[model samples]
Target chain A: MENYLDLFSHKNMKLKERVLIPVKQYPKFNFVGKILGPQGNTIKRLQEETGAKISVLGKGSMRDKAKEEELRKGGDPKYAHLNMDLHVFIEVFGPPCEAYALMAHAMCEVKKFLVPDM
Target chain B: MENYLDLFSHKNMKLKERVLIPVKQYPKFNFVGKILGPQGNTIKRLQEETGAKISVLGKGSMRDKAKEEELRKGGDPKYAHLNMDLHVFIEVFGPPCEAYALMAHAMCEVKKFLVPDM
Candidate 1:
């Protein structure tokens, strides 16, 4: 298992040096999920699966009606909040650089909204 | 129409004083959308209507296949980068404080993930 700090610390590494490393060990997963009001089972399942830290952001509204009312009442309108919980998964298999790239790439695919300028 | 700075700054006002003001004038809108790929019309209309700032972050891939490939190949994974482009709309109808709170609330509802703590 190579330490991430040590692996990326080689003095001879070049700016363009792109490295690919394999996932030898699975790190604790970190997940963040943002959902609407009142979903407890979903959060529980996510926690059980990835063992990731979880946080939930909820607003008091069953529908968009309240939101509309706020807007019309000359009051500040309220939006939804994000709930995220995930576990930290760190393992040794490849260089940190490649690991970061791979994770980022995976995230990009999973969440297309993240990448606006494809 | 009251200036945001002026309304928010009264020598006698207290921090606990919560004020609700009406939207007298419409200000320019600002929006940011994160999508997978090739959603041109969405971006176009958003720009035309709100005249707000908009930016796009896109990854090169159809679905998650390309992203999966990058992960397998030991490359740096790319997550979605937010793309934003918008026109600046500054209008005066209420204090900036309530405006900010309202927008934040609306955004919270629209994008629950943003507010991790709810």
Candidate 2:
């Protein structure tokens, strides 16, 4: 074996997989709160454990400009929080099989929050 | 009728109805994008048409601290977006029947974006 580690590093070693998950249910069941925990400890743990980059894309505010204005006016924004496109994109970068497996696992974990009945 | 408007205003006047919706499906279907439209004009229209105060509550960032830090570091925050507790609270204020009706109508319009197949 001619230095397998060196060959792997020099070759096309890592692959990327993207998992798209709908997160509109976070409010329905308070899933977002449960997932984030206090100060985002829960989600931080999830990202560390999964070894994947999980990102929330799009704005949840129905009135982005209004929300910005409210913040500018120093008004309490609790009542201004409304999302129009809340989605999560999970990116896994690793060996092909490992990346796919990691992505699948992450997807399943995220889906657990969005079960129809739950 | 003793001036119904005056009596109503002097008496109980208005009622408020709250509608809680699950938005975890936004990422799955891009419902948030369609709902918000360009610069949030779509959701703005929805709120005006329904006469309900639509708000998105809770942080969507899985790594709230990291996201804030990223912003402080002047890095692009797009990938930092990940929501765990994303929820929308719709409040309709009017007469009891009118408030309830407005809430129901707003809820239905928002739900149109989260159909399972769509």
Candidate 3:
């Protein structure tokens, strides 16, 4: 029983060309190590399985390198953490939904060692 | 340069039967109210456009009635919050990827007002 009568207009936002999601926040650096498992076999397995062009960018990539410097100077951890939104950027060429499915799946895979219950 | 060279036969995880994600933690309830938007017209728009069945279950749904009581009794807000992993349960009949795309899209829509920067 589904009723999605607003399929074409509403917000008029067609499928986006790319999307970036911050799958995990804290322990940020460690997660990528897992994403890059065994000489990057993990990522290789991921991109192929899902059909999405993906790249992992480490660091809380913020405005310039100043944000990292903020964290280094023994400053605030939360604020330091906020902008550290390091993410996996997907340049979606195939269907976007497939990309997300793969990402969520990868997230579950990564979470096995990272959160255990994520 | 695509190489999903190991997708079909890894870990025997055939396209998951179902996937659940905790879209938000603290301010858990607020996010849903937005998710439910104006008699749920927002959700209506989401489903039709994306071809996915979605439902918003407010609260950091946990193991039992016990978890809610813990939060209601003024328990540590952080602890009160952690298990509150409030989420949107999506039953995917369409391709799994489409479901994820819609969820991520809805997530972005909800974030505009809730986190402003999320």
Best by TM-score: 2
Mind giving the per-residue lDDT tens digits that candidate 2 earns over A1-118?
0111111232432323222224433344544456566777877888888776765433432224666555646645553323324445566665323443465456556555435353
lDDT string for model 2 (B1-118, tens) is: 0111211232332323222224443344544456566777887998998787875433432224666555645645553323324434556565322443464566556555434353
Best by DockQ: 3
lDDT of 3 by residue, B1-118 (tens): 1222112122322222122232433433445556566777877877676445666543543334676676667766554334433545454432223344455554434334334344
Error of 2 at A103 (Å): 44
Which lDDT value does model 1 have at B45? Answer: 52
Candidate 1 matches the true fold with a TM-score of 0.18
Candidate 2 regions with alpha-carbon error over 4 angstroms? A1-118, B1-27, B61-84, B116-118
User: Of the true interface contacts, what fraction does each candidate have?
Assistant: 0.00, 0.00, 0.09
* Residues A1-118, model 3: lDDT tens digits: 2222122122332222222233433434455566656777887887676555555543533333675676657666544434433545444422223334445554334334334334
Tell me the lDDT of model 2 at B112. 54
Q: Where is the poorest 10-residue window by lDDT in model 2 chain A?
A: A1-10
Higher TM-score: candidate 1 or 2? 2
Worst lDDT 10-window in candidate 1 chain B: B14-23
Ranked by lDDT from best down, the candidates are 2, 3, 1
DockQ, candidate 3, comes to 0.06
